Amino acid sequence: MAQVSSSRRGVYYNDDIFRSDVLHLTQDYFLPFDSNLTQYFSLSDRYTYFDNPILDFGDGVYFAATEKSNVIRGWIFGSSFDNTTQSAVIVNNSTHIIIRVCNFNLCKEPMYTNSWVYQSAFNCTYDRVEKKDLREYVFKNRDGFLSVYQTYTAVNLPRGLPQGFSVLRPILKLPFGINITSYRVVMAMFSSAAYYVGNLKYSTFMLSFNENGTITDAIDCSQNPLAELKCTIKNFNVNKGIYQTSNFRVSPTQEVVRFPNITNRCPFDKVFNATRFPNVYAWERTKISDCVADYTVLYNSTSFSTFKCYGVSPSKLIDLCFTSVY
């Protein structure tokens, strides 16, 4: 549970378009530079307290794992980790790559050579079964598409996590469609290794492309005043002098909502479903005041032929407060 600094790690391609020899900057969910990652330890049995908890997906995740004998196999995403909700598994043995989304009956801890990943699964929706060492991954899930980024390299580190810049690459665009909230890590069983976990935050990054679609360098504009200056002047090399800087430092993270405490409910079952509507030349006007507008109790029975609003959007109507309604 130790915190390890991750300097300039976690860079991936947030967009699929092709860019060559440009200095592009964008606002998206990235791993912040020099952020603290939690360290978890793992390596029959191996040695005492070497286990894995249930982590938090958030809006993105950076998974970096160090291995010596391929002890880490895969991940199990989900929301509630029961069979009341759906889950996905991405694990492998042989050269067998297994990816499927089902309602799983999970074990307490997954071991997989002796393949104790699940007890059983039912109502399987999407199945695409096809078949000293540092591998790292980035997982994101928006608009019903789990994107996977990875890179893989050979190292000789006895302890700790090496520092540097790392760019990842897309492989999969799997259309799962499930709600992902929390995940786990699947470890193998036999007849030191450790992994580090970081979460993505909404920030502004600037990237340099080496005219081949390959990222040369990346700048996090919220790190230090030097990077903010570099993002402001839109360049990587800065001449000596004084320059004014824009705002790239502070960002809100929490929500405050304050509404009046009107608990009474006003009748949409009497104005709408009245006894007898009048003639068109004798149309009636009724003032509505001092209540709460729900618009969701009609979802059960009444279906609307047309509902069109002028000056407001129907989707934004639930968050609005009105002064006078007729």
Partner: protein
Amino acid sequence: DVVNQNAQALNTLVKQLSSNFGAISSVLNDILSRLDKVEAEVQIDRLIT
């Protein structure tokens, strides 16, 4: 006169923010709160221009 011209230019630049430029409101907060951004993007484009 130089000081007054500079002050008047700055005050005019501040006061020109009250023009909606054809949007349904001058300030951006009720543009974002009143509509979804599918058409509020078009609304904010005019203000930006």
